[PDB]
Structure 1
Amino acid sequence: HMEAQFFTDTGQHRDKNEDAGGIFYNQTNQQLLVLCDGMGGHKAGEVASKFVTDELKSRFEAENLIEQHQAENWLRNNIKDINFQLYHYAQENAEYKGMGTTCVCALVFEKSVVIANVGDSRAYVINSRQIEQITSDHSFVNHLVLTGQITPEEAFTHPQRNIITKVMGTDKRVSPDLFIKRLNFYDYLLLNSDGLTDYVKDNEIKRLLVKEGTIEDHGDQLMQLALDNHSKDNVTFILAAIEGDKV
């Protein structure tokens, strides 16, 4: 496990906080990081994001030991099962029909992290010289950037900029992206909703983290930076400190 902290804010000009997440521990005190951005464009986004977060918590706390070689399968299978349960829960309740959420999550190991991603929430690793986005946004504008139809700058001024193309709960099937990242030579792991990075550039995040301070110092400053950039969305992130290999 890492020293890690969860941070969330409703943001300016949002009525409700539909982001969810947490830091959870299994029976041998291994660590799972979870972040979910419930869909504001559909009904009941807070129900969906907290549904997925609660299921991951419950499933992980029931486990004794998930070692690194089991982690990709565990995350893929549980994300698929939770998507199935959420989808049919939404179909069975007319006031929830159409609800959904992103999910990025990470199982932490001594020298690596295993990440699953559905949607446009993100995971990054950061050190003094670079910031690497591990995940790939399942967003319509990312589709437009990759197909060369718009520039990454034009993405921020697109009418359909908030649209996402892979979501938990909207279909009975889902295919999460799985990533394995070695933590050696990195200083921080960051999971975040788009309320942060829609408004704060990667280099701004890296510059903040290279400074002195605790995880809570950095987290509060990063939240203030998102708000100073007038984020119009819920802003949520988990910051986790990677312990350098001691001599």
Structure 2
Amino acid sequence: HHSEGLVPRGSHMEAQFFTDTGQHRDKNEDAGGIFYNQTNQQLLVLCDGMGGHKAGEVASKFVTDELKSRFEAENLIEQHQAENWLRNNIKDINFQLYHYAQENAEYKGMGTTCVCALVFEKSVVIANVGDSRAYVINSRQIEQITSDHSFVNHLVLTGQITPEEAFTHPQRNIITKVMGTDKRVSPDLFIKRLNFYDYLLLNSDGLTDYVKDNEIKRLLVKEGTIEDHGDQLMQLALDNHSKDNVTFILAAIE
């Protein structure tokens, strides 16, 4: 009976993907993109391959390419089924990535984070594995929707350290949930209403490990196009001395 209802109205955001190796990593091990299904629904994908394990770029490209293949083959995903579609496809891809890593001795142990978003008229449905992020931003507030699967965030969430301490912690890079390392994964799923926000941001930690939320909001709330803001936001991460790959998708909410 939930499916006895009207088809989803067409809704895209103007969105663009930005990525840079940066000056301190051998490879760009981030990956991602903006994909469209056969009814022109939109999926945003960003993945941060693990630098401390082999073949991060293989893992992130694999998960991105799988999501692209799978979503472009789809016709329609109803709003109320979007969480299930993302959870089931992330779980499947994770299982496939686990075996790919186990079998190919050049890539043993590889894995990646994944944050992704399926866009609807009035809402976005986000799935998250790892410490890449999704935010909504307006002139008053910048809200992180996801919760990092990182060890320092476990310390924050148990009151062992403060957010500022986590930002400077020597173990800040360690992650607690990632694609490819185990046969099973439980992604976090979120639904966010879009009505009074101006931007949806998906990003790798190359951005937010060096640029605080306040700075991102101040940039994004000035007059500017998505191209201007993306170019400036990338420059800001570099000027803040990011030692990582920096990747993000900015999507303007109309």
State the TM bucket, normalised to the shorter chain: over 0.9
Q: Structure 2: how far apart are the matches of 1:70 and 1:45?
A: 31
Structure 1 residues without counterparts, runs of 5 or longer: none
Q: Structure 1: how far apart are the matches of 2:199 and 2:159?
A: 32
Deviation, structure 1 residue 37: 0.2
Q: Deviations over 1:132-188 (max 9, x none)?
A: 000000000001111222221221232211000000000000000000000001000
1:5 counterpart SS class: strand
Q: Deviations over 1:213-232 (max 9, x none)?
A: 11001000000100010000
Q: Structure 1: how far apart are the matches of 2:153 and 2:202?
A: 19
Deviation, structure 1 residue 203: 0.9
1:129 counterpart SS class: coil
Q: Structure 1: how far apart are the matches of 2:208 and 2:86?
A: 24
2:112 counterpart SS class: coil
1:77 counterpart SS class: helix
Q: Structure 2: how far apart are the matches of 1:84 and 1:189?
A: 29
Task: Give the structure-1-normalised TM-score.
Answer: 0.97
Deviation, structure 1 residue 126: 0.3
| Mean Cα deviation higher: 88-97 or 29-38 | 88-97
Task: Give the structure-2-normalised TM-score.
Answer: 0.95
Q: Deviations over 1:93-152 (max 9, x none)?
A: 111111000000000001100000000000000001000000000000001111222221
Q: Structure 2: how far apart are the matches of 1:143 and 1:230?
A: 26
Q: Deviations over 1:17-61 (max 9, x none)?
A: 000000000001110000000000000000000000000000000
Q: Structure 2: how far apart are the matches of 1:171 and 1:79?
A: 13
Deviation, structure 1 residue 69: 1.0
Percent identity, aligned pairs only, is 100
Q: Structure 2: how far apart are the matches of 1:102 and 1:88?
A: 17
Alignment of 1:3-18 (within 5 A): 3-18=14-29
2:242 counterpart SS class: coil
Q: Structure 2: how far apart are the matches of 1:156 and 1:56?
A: 31
Q: Structure 2: how far apart are the matches of 1:45 and 1:161?
A: 18
1:239 counterpart SS class: strand
Structure 2 residues without counterparts, runs of 5 or longer: 1-11
TM-align CA RMSD: 0.7
